[PDB]
Design an enzyme around this catalytic site. Structure first.
Site, mmCIF file in Angstrom:
data_model
loop_
_atom_site.group_PDB
_atom_site.id
_atom_site.type_symbol
_atom_site.label_atom_id
_atom_site.label_comp_id
_atom_site.label_asym_id
_atom_site.label_seq_id
_atom_site.Cartn_x
_atom_site.Cartn_y
_atom_site.Cartn_z
ATOM 1 N N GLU A 93 27.705 -21.715 -5.004
ATOM 2 C CA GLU A 93 26.854 -21.659 -6.199
ATOM 3 C C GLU A 93 27.640 -20.967 -7.298
ATOM 4 O O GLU A 93 27.549 -21.336 -8.514
ATOM 5 C CB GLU A 93 25.532 -20.948 -5.891
ATOM 6 N N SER A 109 8.702 -39.476 -38.909
ATOM 7 C CA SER A 109 7.326 -39.196 -38.528
ATOM 8 C C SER A 109 7.242 -38.732 -37.077
ATOM 9 O O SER A 109 7.854 -39.342 -36.179
ATOM 10 C CB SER A 109 6.430 -40.421 -38.678
ATOM 11 N N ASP A 131 0.895 -39.183 -4.320
ATOM 12 C CA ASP A 131 2.104 -39.844 -4.884
ATOM 13 C C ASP A 131 2.078 -39.760 -6.413
ATOM 14 O O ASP A 131 3.124 -39.509 -7.050
ATOM 15 C CB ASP A 131 2.262 -41.313 -4.430
ATOM 16 N N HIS A 133 16.067 -35.068 -17.716
ATOM 17 C CA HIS A 133 14.632 -34.756 -17.926
ATOM 18 C C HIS A 133 14.454 -34.725 -19.478
ATOM 19 O O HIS A 133 15.199 -34.049 -20.191
ATOM 20 C CB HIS A 133 14.345 -33.400 -17.293
HETATM 21 C C1 LIG Z 1 20.561 -13.333 -9.702
HETATM 22 C C2 LIG Z 1 20.801 -14.006 -11.049
HETATM 23 C C3 LIG Z 1 21.281 -12.943 -12.065
HETATM 24 C C4 LIG Z 1 21.850 -15.115 -10.865
HETATM 25 C C5 LIG Z 1 22.106 -15.915 -12.164
HETATM 26 N N1 LIG Z 1 23.007 -17.016 -11.868
HETATM 27 C C6 LIG Z 1 24.330 -16.945 -11.642
HETATM 28 O O1 LIG Z 1 24.955 -15.864 -11.679
HETATM 29 O O2 LIG Z 1 24.945 -18.121 -11.320
HETATM 30 C C7 LIG Z 1 26.358 -18.231 -11.582
HETATM 31 C C8 LIG Z 1 26.788 -19.712 -11.555
HETATM 32 C C9 LIG Z 1 25.889 -20.493 -12.545
HETATM 33 C C10 LIG Z 1 26.451 -21.864 -12.956
HETATM 34 O O3 LIG Z 1 27.664 -22.101 -12.741
HETATM 35 O O4 LIG Z 1 25.647 -22.657 -13.523
HETATM 36 C C11 LIG Z 1 26.747 -17.611 -12.952
HETATM 37 O O5 LIG Z 1 25.891 -17.528 -13.873
HETATM 38 O O6 LIG Z 1 27.916 -17.188 -13.035
HETATM 39 C C12 LIG Z 1 20.799 -16.536 -12.735
HETATM 40 O O7 LIG Z 1 20.187 -17.377 -12.041
HETATM 41 O O8 LIG Z 1 20.442 -16.120 -13.856
HETATM 42 ZN ZN LIG Z 2 23.444 -15.999 -7.330
HETATM 43 ZN ZN LIG Z 3 25.977 -14.983 -9.186
#
Ligand SMILES: CC(C)C[C@@H](NC(=O)O[C@@H](CCC(=O)O)C(=O)O)C(=O)O
Ligand SMILES: [Zn+2]
Ligand SMILES: [Zn+2]
Ligand SMILES: *[C@@H]1O[C@H](CO)[C@@H](O[C@@H]2O[C@H](CO)[C@@H](O[C@@H]3O[C@H](CO[C@H]4O[C@H](CO)[C@@H](O)[C@H](O)[C@@H]4O)[C@@H](O)[C@H](O[C@H]4O[C@H](CO)[C@@H](O)[C@H](O)[C@@H]4O)[C@@H]3O)[C@H](O)[C@H]2NC(C)=O)[C@H](O)[C@H]1NC(C)=O
Ligand SMILES: *[C@@H]1O[C@H](CO)[C@@H](O[C@@H]2O[C@H](CO)[C@@H](O[C@@H]3O[C@H](CO[C@H]4O[C@H](CO)[C@@H](O)[C@H](O)[C@@H]4O)[C@@H](O)[C@H](O[C@H]4O[C@H](CO)[C@@H](O)[C@H](O)[C@@H]4O)[C@@H]3O)[C@H](O)[C@H]2NC(C)=O)[C@H](O)[C@H]1NC(C)=O
Ligand SMILES: *[C@@H]1O[C@H](CO)[C@@H](O[C@@H]2O[C@H](CO)[C@@H](O[C@@H]3O[C@H](CO)[C@@H](O)[C@H](O)[C@@H]3O)[C@H](O)[C@H]2NC(C)=O)[C@H](O)[C@H]1NC(C)=O
Ligand SMILES: *[C@@H]1O[C@H](CO)[C@@H](O[C@@H]2O[C@H](CO)[C@@H](O[C@@H]3O[C@H](CO)[C@@H](O)[C@H](O)[C@@H]3O)[C@H](O)[C@H]2NC(C)=O)[C@H](O)[C@H]1NC(C)=O
Ligand SMILES: *[C@@H]1O[C@H](CO)[C@@H](O[C@@H]2O[C@H](CO)[C@@H](O)[C@H](O)[C@H]2NC(C)=O)[C@H](O)[C@H]1NC(C)=O
Ligand SMILES: *[C@@H]1O[C@H](CO)[C@@H](O[C@@H]2O[C@H](CO)[C@@H](O)[C@H](O)[C@H]2NC(C)=O)[C@H](O)[C@H]1NC(C)=O
Ligand SMILES: *[C@@H]1O[C@H](CO)[C@@H](O[C@@H]2O[C@H](CO)[C@@H](O)[C@H](O)[C@H]2NC(C)=O)[C@H](O)[C@H]1NC(C)=O
Ligand SMILES: *[C@@H]1O[C@H](CO)[C@@H](O[C@@H]2O[C@H](CO)[C@@H](O)[C@H](O)[C@H]2NC(C)=O)[C@H](O)[C@H]1NC(C)=O
Ligand SMILES: CC(C)C[C@@H](NC(=O)O[C@@H](CCC(=O)O)C(=O)O)C(=O)O
Ligand SMILES: *[C@@H]1O[C@H](CO)[C@@H](O)[C@H](O)[C@H]1NC(C)=O
Ligand SMILES: *[C@@H]1O[C@H](CO)[C@@H](O)[C@H](O)[C@H]1NC(C)=O
Ligand SMILES: *[C@@H]1O[C@H](CO)[C@@H](O)[C@H](O)[C@H]1NC(C)=O
Ligand SMILES: *[C@@H]1O[C@H](CO)[C@@H](O)[C@H](O)[C@H]1NC(C)=O
Ligand SMILES: *[C@@H]1O[C@H](CO)[C@@H](O)[C@H](O)[C@H]1NC(C)=O
Ligand SMILES: *[C@@H]1O[C@H](CO)[C@@H](O)[C@H](O)[C@H]1NC(C)=O
Ligand SMILES: [Ca+2]
Ligand SMILES: [Ca+2]
Ligand SMILES: [Cl-]
Ligand SMILES: [Cl-]
Ligand SMILES: [Zn+2]
Ligand SMILES: [Zn+2]
Lengths: 696, 696
Positions: free
Chosen positions: A370, A574, A612, A635
């Site tokens: 992540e 509009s 659904d 979205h």
């Molecule tokens: C626990 C939170 C502070 C984590 C924070 N997210 C996060 O640190 O994710 C990382 C990877 C996010 C990305 O690459 O989109 C970052 O921002 O460096 C959030 O969801 O605001």
């Molecule tokens: Zn995180």
């Molecule tokens: Zn993080």
């Protein structure tokens, strides 16, 4: 009996504590052996906890690491080319961890290599408006300069994009005490503040939802065909490196050129916060030199995917997911979330061993990578997109359970507002002075809705976490909930020790949540949401809440446009179609709600037909052509802000068409595109409404 | 009782005849008052026939018409600029219709205006391979020439695209007796052959599935924002006009330059079929001049949409659709199809008045503007895409029921092969010498499968009709069936009077189907398919038939690649992933089929779960990113041929990457793209397979 109360009562603070300790003794950086070992441990434990199947899903993705024998650092060099000051090579490790191996030093993941040398320009938070102020008002040119920016306010990848577009040849990111040092609190290890040697790690990609930079659209499996690095998605073109405020003080103290334009440009260090370019008179021949030697490397990552098969609708999936990889020990981010997920799986498994099954299938995920761009969740969703879009009911994220100990912080689709209100009314507040009161009561008191008396604030989903692919690409109803700090003005900056070596078990246990009561409350909220989504006979979504918010967003976007009344006259701009669509959605949703409460409750086909309709309502806001130049943000109501990936923007296609429109050289073309986006939005809202009409 | 036999027995030849006569007395050109009046008539009749609701869905789309007071024509001009020969201004009208008003003269819809003047090059059928022969082998340059091409073999829009890309400044299309005059048959009105003054109308767009050229992606409703004409999709850049063989003889007889390269370039006229450029010695100073004054005009069109609500699964749609608009009287195209649809609706309505309803909802459509690019079906599908992709079971097309009287001609998804075999075994053959035998027996005898003894030929779906948006954009299982002529080698050329003023009621009644027995048989096939799709408890799709065809297509594409063994070695081009995916699909489909026959037949959730797996199987072959440069062709197994819109191509992404690859200047890049397409195909096949796995 086997009901939500039995589930919730089985959750224990002491287990969450034991799990957090277990998950935070060693670093779990994505792509490392230690992180694979933890994946295997959680796979084994989830099987023992009682899940029907638990598998690893692996991918080979682009990751980025410093060179162990060629460290990154920044210098001030004199006219002779002597390096007279060097930034730190590592953060001083916390007490009793000074012998832990493999702590990755601070770096900006995916920075290119380079040794650029030049004069410094200070750019405040490096926001779009900071660069507007510099170029347009102050007439300062960043072309060929090294910019120095303070962390905070917006995602760091947006700062880097903004600096590149300004023509910078390098970026230095630093943590200012104004943003990362709360007055009257001590530095770690004596309190929860950032010390002057602490540094925030983090990636600086601009992926716009793509996932692995080499395989946009498709999973990075064993036969995947990769783009070359030159065609990769989202990589920065200039070197970038983060530093702490001791080092930043040394780079900023000699800054000359123009004074800061006002006080919102000054942080808390004892320096002038001059904008530059370059240093004052005596030092004007000294320069700043970066040395970046990090490498990008295709590396294997592992998601753990656990299945609890539904008894009645096994082809309907409720997903609870959060990541496992961390920058260093991950004491808050992400293990305070992962420990909660672990306890939720344990509770569901206890009920399962007693003969219970949820109505719908529950999928549990421990995502990898992540921190390198939502890579593990995104690749898995790309692999499984057909299953998810026809079967996915909801996604509940589970990164850090706490980032403070003040009150609850929820971001979700309007379809979950009623679910969250009802659940929090049934939960005990853990807060001091609210003994015997509901979580709804304490949360509403501490975080009032800006619009409605006696209701709590619930925010839009942006991005920066693993819900992004599910919500903004695939259109699956998504939500997240965690405990947070006071003053949500500072909400995008993080807590002080965010992504530093100091985020440890001890930090949480000593300073955030010694009794694990906030962790327990967040486990009850996330688990309770998953329980209701997976077990309610009628899906617990209220389409009328979408209708309310759509009118609010339409009013907001119309108000932005109405700053340009002469252009709206000239180009016949509009908003009538959009308000008509929202009115129609409101009427159709009202009638659908009446049928949902009236329909013959004995008829499982009308039920599933109506279930659904509820499940595919979020899906109806997806445009298969995506938003302009952002094909994976599909979205039409919500997208991450083009200026700040962490913030959600409503009607993003119209918002971006209107942004800074007065500066476009061809106004007829610019307003033509505003009109096109209004048509797309009005069409999509009406099309979503029509999915709630009687089906024939 | 109310079963398929009751439905089929209610269909009457005499009603089809009465309807065909009723629909063909006056022209019904799209966008005209006469066509709106017929839409209103069919809406009224469908209501009277017993449908639950019948609505008009209207759109405002770009159409194209000649200028009534500035006629289109072609000349031969001498060196003085005198026009010494002019092509006809109209086709001689058929007996007893010489006083019918508003017969549109022959023209190529969407031609730009122009009066280009130049030398003629004859290009045979203007196929990709004809242009390869001219430029590469014969060294003839079409740049700045007017090309003359015979109709046949491929869709006329592909000819125009090929001529433009060759640098032609105009195109003349003509009907050669070799392709449109069957030996030993008389010309209309004495037989079914094309007279020398007859001319084939038809559009020359290259839309690639976009629908209305001004609104790709979105319905052309009342608030739509249109592209400017310069950004419109699919318009030709050079003027184009069609002529008959009397006029073509006059243009071709003076042709000089090179002899035709071989006999496959010579038609049946008494001319040399010299390629040019220009005329022989004496006439070498004469030129050809086109005069095109047609205009493109946004015009309202009307679809009729009839609903018969399902008793058990009203949120599942089986669609029977065909178009109503015609070039002139539409005696075969489309009214021989529309009269059949009208009788099917009448039969379903008779059963409904007796208390019966189908299990699933049946939608009936009378589409407008098919002749101008599938506009009415495509705009309606764009408007309703969310409903169709979550609820659409199948689409059965219903253009002309007969184009000959020899045997049945079916094109469909492999998911319908077993349905079509089983149904035709239960129908009586109408053929002479097969009295008392099944339609399956006569069809298999007359049109044997090239691959299997004792089975009939069933072709791939291409495009050129209103199923395109449902099948290639949205991934809804689709099929079509009609009676056809012998020698399916000539199948893409049409029957001789195709799109001419001579396609009348009298043509059908005198020369094709005097007893309306072939019409009746086609009504039993289309109606019988719709009945089974809408009423079978388990959807009548066999996934194992897809597995068989996928292996055939994989063998075929591998064989094309293997013409380049040295390149496959150098660039490590492996088809292993694709064959692995097909093997997996074969295994998973086999296991799914076993469950489908074994599963607890009393459980409506397992049934609907398994019905959803069958319905979404076609949907799984959709790639949301589309094929390269063709965003509205999203099916990865089938797309219309890039060389001939009427033909289907299998694994089109790999096929187009391999086509003429030996001529690409950068082989590493070209073979890289072949490998990328293999990965996309192998991934999509495996992903489709996994939708048939156990769901949890
Ligand atoms: C626990 C939170 C502070 C984590 C924070 N997210 C996060 O640190 O994710 C990382 C990877 C996010 C990305 O690459 O989109 C970052 O921002 O460096 C959030 O969801 O605001
Ligand atoms: Zn995180
Ligand atoms: Zn993080
Ligand atoms: C919110 O929901 C409402 C429904 O309550 C929708 O209302 C539709 O609005 C459109 C305008 O965008 C109307 O379109 C008009 O239709 C007329 C014919 O309508 C009749 O016939 C159809 C069958 O084809 C029936 O559905 C309908 O009930 C009527 O019986 C046309 O004649 C109109 O065109 C004429 O006027 C316009 C405007 O001046 C000119 O530009 C044209 O050239 C032409 O002269 C027009 O197209 C439609 O009838 C409405 N449906 C209703 C009331 O059922 C809203 O559209 C919807 N909002 C959004 C954003 O979708
Ligand atoms: C057709 O269907 C079959 C299933 O019957 C699929 O088979 C999979 O094929 C892939 C190869 O593409 C295999 O991938 C390999 O996985 C190994 C680990 O697998 C174990 O662990 C996982 C859990 O993560 C389990 O699912 C699995 O059962 C095993 O227990 C890796 O170690 C392999 O990587 C190593 O070898 C390769 C190749 O030499 C090197 O490049 C690597 O660097 C590394 O050393 C490899 O990734 C997968 O295991 C197979 N699954 C099975 C048998 O269940 C086919 O993929 C499918 N066809 C298509 C087109 O999808
Ligand atoms: C959140 O909680 C509220 C309050 O309980 C839920 O709304 C309530 O839902 C029930 C349906 O179970 C409604 O009861 C119905 O009343 C009508 C008569 O008005 C009757 O016809 C039905 O048979 C049924 O008894 C109740 O009115 C309604 N209360 C409201 C809207 O104030 C809400 O559904 C919950 N949200 C969820 C589960 O997402
Ligand atoms: C087209 O017609 C064929 C021939 O009728 C259909 O195949 C047959 O379908 C039935 C299912 O209704 C199969 O019967 C089953 O047999 C097994 C034992 O082998 C038993 O376990 C089941 O209870 C059931 O009785 C039959 O075997 C099968 N025959 C074949 C494959 O040769 C086919 O389904 C039809 N296609 C359609 C409707 O699309
Ligand atoms: C975290 O907890 C796990 C699970 O209890 C520990 O892993 C087990 O360790 C024991 C004793 O060393 C082994 O016999 C087992 O094979 C392990 N089980 C699993 C499922 O892996 C792990 O050692 C703990 N980690 C820390 C740092 O305390
Ligand atoms: C900052 O670090 C650099 C690089 O290690 C130091 O400069 C080096 O000094 C050594 C020993 O004097 C020389 O052998 C190298 O040639 C130098 N390298 C470069 C790139 O200049 C520098 O002394 C350090 N500055 C401090 C500690 O103030
Ligand atoms: C085609 O058939 C229709 C339907 O029978 C005819 O339209 C009807 O004509 C009668 C008598 O002129 C009118 O009273 C009705 O109002 C019409 N009904 C409908 C539903 O439109 C039509 O005239 C026939 N056309 C031809 C050319 O024979
Ligand atoms: C082909 O048609 C053209 C256009 O109608 C004819 O040329 C015209 O002849 C009239 C009367 O002689 C003149 O007034 C016009 O000036 C001419 N127009 C042009 C554009 O040349 C021509 O005579 C016809 N050729 C035939 C019938 O062979
Ligand atoms: C009855 C058939 C001969 C009709 C024939 N289709 C057809 O004539 O459609 C028109 C429009 C097709 C298109 O624009 O894709 C045409 O080819 O000009 C077909 O389906 O092959
Ligand atoms: C890292 O730096 C070392 C020492 O200068 C060098 O030998 C090696 O090539 C580099 N490693 C990578 C992965 O680039
Ligand atoms: C900034 O500086 C560079 C050259 O040093 C130049 O190309 C660019 O146009 C400048 N921008 C301004 C003055 O706005
Ligand atoms: C946790 O709560 C206590 C009591 O209000 C407070 O002193 C402390 O600062 C809080 N911790 C954090 C990290 O905000
Ligand atoms: C058609 O031609 C006439 C006569 O030359 C002209 O007046 C008119 O402008 C043209 N019509 C259109 C629709 O272009
Ligand atoms: C064909 O002719 C034109 C100029 O008349 C020229 O631009 C083009 O290159 C030629 N193509 C050849 C010789 O292949
Ligand atoms: C219809 O069938 C008869 C008998 O074979 C044949 O003479 C006639 O040519 C057929 N019509 C067409 C249009 O093929
Ligand atoms: Ca990918
Ligand atoms: Ca359109
Ligand atoms: Cl979260
Ligand atoms: Cl057809
Ligand atoms: Zn047709
Ligand atoms: Zn046609």
């Amino acid at each position: 009996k086997h009901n939500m109360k039995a589930f919730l009562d089985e959750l224990k603070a002491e287990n969450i504590k034991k799990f957090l300790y277990n998950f935070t003794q060693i670093p779990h950086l994505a792509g490392t052996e230690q992180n694979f070992q933890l994946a295997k441990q959680i796979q084994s434990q989830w099987k023992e906890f009682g899940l029907d199947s638990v598998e690893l899903a692996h991918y080979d993705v682009l990751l980025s690491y410093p060179n162990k024998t060629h460290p990154n650092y920044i210098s001030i060099i004199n006219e002779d080319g002597n390096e007279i000051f060097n930034t730190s090579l590592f953060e001083p490790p916390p007490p009793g961890y000074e012998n832990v191996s493999d702590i990755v030093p601070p770096f900006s993941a995916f920075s290119p290599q380079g040794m650029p040398e030049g004069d410094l320009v200070y750019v405040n938070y490096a926001r779009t408006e900071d660069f507007f102020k510099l170029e347009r008002d102050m007439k300062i040119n960043c072309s060929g300069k090294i910019v120095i920016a303070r962390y905070g306010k917006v995602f760091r990848g947006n700062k880097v994009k903004n600096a590149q577009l300004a023509g910078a040849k390098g970026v230095i990111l630093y943590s200012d005490p104004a943003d990362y040092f709360a007055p009257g609190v001590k530095s770690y290890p004596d309190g929860w503040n950032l010390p002057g040697g602490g540094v925030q790690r983090g990636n600086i990609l601009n992926l716009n939802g793509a996932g692995d930079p080499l395989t946009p659209g498709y999973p990075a499996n064993e036969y995947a065909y990769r783009r070359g690095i030159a065609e990769a998605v989202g990589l920065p073109s200039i070197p970038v490196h983060p530093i702490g405020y001791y080092d930043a003080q040394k780079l900023l103290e000699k800054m000359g050129g123009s004074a800061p334009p006002d006080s919102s440009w000054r942080g808390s260090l004892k320096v002038p916060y001059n904008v530059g370019p370059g240093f004052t008179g005596n030092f004007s021949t000294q320069k700043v030199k970066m040395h970046i030697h990090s490498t990008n490397e295709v590396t294997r990552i592992y998601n753990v995917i656990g299945t609890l098969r539904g008894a009645v609708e096994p082809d309907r999936y409720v997903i609870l997911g959060g990541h496992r990889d961390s920058w260093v020990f991950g004491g808050i981010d992400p293990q305070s979330g992962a420990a909660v997920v672990h306890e939720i799986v344990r509770s569901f498994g206890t009920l399962k061993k007693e003969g219970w099954r949820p109505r719908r299938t529950i999928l549990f995920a421990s995502w990898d990578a992540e921190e390198f761009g939502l890579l593990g969740s995104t690749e898995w969703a790309e692999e499984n997109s057909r299953l998810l879009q026809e079967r996915g009911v909801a996604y509940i994220n589970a990164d850090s359970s706490i980032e403070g100990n003040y009150t609850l912080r929820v971001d979700c689709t309007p379809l979950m507002y009623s679910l969250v209100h009802n659940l929090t009314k049934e939960l005990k507040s853990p807060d001091e002075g609210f003994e015997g009161k509901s979580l709804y009561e304490s949360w509403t008191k501490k975080s009032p809705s800006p619009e409605f008396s006696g209701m709590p604030r619930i925010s839009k989903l942006g991005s920066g976490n693993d819900f992004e692919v599910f919500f903004q690409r695939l259109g699956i109803a998504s939500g997240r909930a965690r405990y947070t700090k006071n003053w949500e003005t500072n909400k995008f900056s993080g807590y002080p020790l965010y992504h530093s070596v100091y985020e440890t078990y001890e930090l949480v246990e000593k300073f955030y949540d010694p009794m694990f009561k906030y962790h327990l409350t967040v486990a009850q909220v996330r688990g309770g949401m998953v329980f209701e989504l997976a077990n309610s006979i009628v899906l617990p979504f209220d389409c009328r809440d979408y209708a309310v918010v759509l009118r609010k967003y339409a009013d907001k976007i119309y108000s932005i446009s109405m700053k340009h009344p002469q252009e709206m006259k000239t180009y016949s701009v509009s908003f009538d179609s959009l308000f008509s669509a929202v009115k129609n959605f409101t009427e159709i949703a009202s009638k659908f709600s009446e049928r949902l409460q009236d329909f013959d409750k004995s008829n499982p086909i009308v039920l599933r037909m109506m279930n659904d309709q509820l499940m595919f309502l979020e899906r109806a806001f997806i445009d298969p052509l995506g938003l302009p130049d952002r094909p994976f943000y599909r979205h039409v109501i919500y997208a991450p802000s083009s200026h700040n990936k962490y913030a959600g923007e409503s009607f993003p296609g119209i918002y971006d068409a209107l942004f800074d429109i007065e500066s476009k050289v061809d106004p007829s073309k610019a307003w033509g595109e505003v009109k096109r986006q209004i048509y797309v939005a009005a069409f999509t809202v009406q099309a979503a409404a029509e999915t709630l009409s009687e089906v024939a």
